[PDB]
């Protein structure tokens, strides 16, 4: 679902999930996780994660297989879908608990 961002490097990550802006009233959050069971997901900042990947695909435009060239466009539009404004007065700790 949706989380809270509090402060595992990039190498042991198998899957990463990104929410739309409607799923959590406008926030951009992600889920980092490692591959009975019980997977523990580390939560991350969406815009920084989304912005991270966009930079990767661009930097390697000469290496896109046609499956990634489509991914680039989808990561865009989505990125602009989140309004960084209309966030100054919103409560950032909506999803925090504090022990």
């Amino acid at each position: 679902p949706c989380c809270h961002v509090t402060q595992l490097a990039l190498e042991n990550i198998s899957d990463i999930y990104l929410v739309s802006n409607q799923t959590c009233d406008g926030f951009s959050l992600a889920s980092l996780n490692s591959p009975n069971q019980l997977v523990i997901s580390r939560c991350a900042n969406g815009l920084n994660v989304v912005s991270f990947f966009i930079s990767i695909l661009k930097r390697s435009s000469s290496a896109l297989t046609g499956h990634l060239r489509e991914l680039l466009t989808t990561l865009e539009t989505l990125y602009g879908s989140f309004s960084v404004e209309d966030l100054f007065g919103a409560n950032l700790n909506r999803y925090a608990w504090h022990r």
Partner: antibody
Amino acid sequence: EVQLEQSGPELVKPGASVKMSCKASGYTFTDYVISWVKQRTGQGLEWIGEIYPESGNTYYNEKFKGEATLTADKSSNTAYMQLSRLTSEDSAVYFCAEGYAMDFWGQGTSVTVSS
Amino acid sequence: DIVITQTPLSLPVSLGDQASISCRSSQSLLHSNGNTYLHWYLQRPGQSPKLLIYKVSNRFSGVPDRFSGSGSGTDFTLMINRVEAEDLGVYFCSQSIHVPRTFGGGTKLEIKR
């Protein structure tokens, strides 16, 4: 979504030992918490001994310290709880719940003590 | 500690009626900052308690729309719109701000005849 499993019921004699296990299986986020509570038949819920398997830090109350201790196993995330020197008034059903809400509860384990 | 008060202790309802349950708190329930940690639970007879509403008025996953939490600060209210059979049981409430959390009395939801 998190689903929990608890130990079977144990018929114990006053002064013996009972160890209950709470196995977590599903999807959650880091630094998650497992809470323990008991209710006597016909009475409400009470104490909230929290344990964080990863962190290991624990928050009991004025009771259930010496009257209880909280262990954990990080390999499978079992979060054990046990208690021996038990009187009559603490025969009850002990519930295990995951989340800060608490979101997901376990079926519970009823331990009845009597000589 | 943080006492808590539910009223009524027993609320007979017919099917289709409307229920209202309050959980008056002893101390304020604000933290960081206007995140009020008040939660509502339902224990159907013979089963484990389950979460209904968390943070005062957020419907947990799987909870129908007829459930709704209200109120703020120190006096709150839970509302069931058109009671169904599967809604009978005991409704507890809890706060998670101050240690210990503490729960409420119960408020049994029963049939009226």
